[PDB]
Amino acid sequence: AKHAVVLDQDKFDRIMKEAPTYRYVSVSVLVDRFKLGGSLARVALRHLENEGIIKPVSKHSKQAIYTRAT
């Protein structure tokens, strides 16, 4: 990945609007669909999960299993 380890405002907005429609949400997924690549993606995911937005399925760390609200 060509850097892309920034919690940029535009990037955040994109994430907000692209995490729905798609059923599966993960760090790997984010990396694939070109936004954040690596460590700060996890942080972003965490801060999307305060109340609602994306619902958890995983009860496990390292691999994240998350589905948007239907």
Partner: protein
């Protein structure tokens, strides 16, 4: 954990202590790129400074960087004893020093020169281009110069 998005304030790729410090490596691990600076001790330095490790390379404000530099170059005053730094005890001053960037190599060179002058075994080996620290050259070191 940080929810802060941050605007255009951090400038990536920094020129610190002459040697180029690269972008978005985790402060400690950004400092490691500089010679003389190494992992654990970098971390310790950071801790001493009182900057949070979970930050970007460009994130660091100038003052913090300055403090870090000070900690590195003058180590003894900020509670860093012997089992800590590069040239412990030393051969030239008696005081211990945490040599950096373009100093350690120079010191090494000086040592080599002295050895050569005084024709010691290690020095001889170095002159030759041979393995010093207990190795059997029956197999060891076929890469050459």
């Amino acid at each position: 954990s940080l929810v802060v998005q941050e605007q255009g304030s951090f400038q990536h790729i920094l020129r610190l202590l002459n040697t180029n410090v690269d972008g978005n490596i985790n402060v400690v691990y950004a400092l490691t790129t500089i010679r003389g600076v190494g992992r654990r001790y970098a971390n310790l330095v950071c801790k001493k400074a009182d900057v949070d490790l979970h930050k970007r390379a460009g994130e660091l404000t100038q003052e913090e960087l300055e403090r870090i530099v000070q900690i590195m170059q003058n180590p003894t005053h900020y509670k860093i004893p012997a089992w800590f730094l590069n040239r412990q005890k030393d051969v030239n001053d008696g005081k211990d020093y945490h040599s950096l960037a373009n100093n350690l190599e120079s010191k090494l060179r000086d040592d080599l020169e002295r050895l050569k002058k005084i024709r010691s075994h290690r020095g001889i080996r170095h002159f030759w281009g041979l393995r010093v620290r207990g190795q059997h050259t029956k197999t060891t070191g076929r890469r050459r110069a």
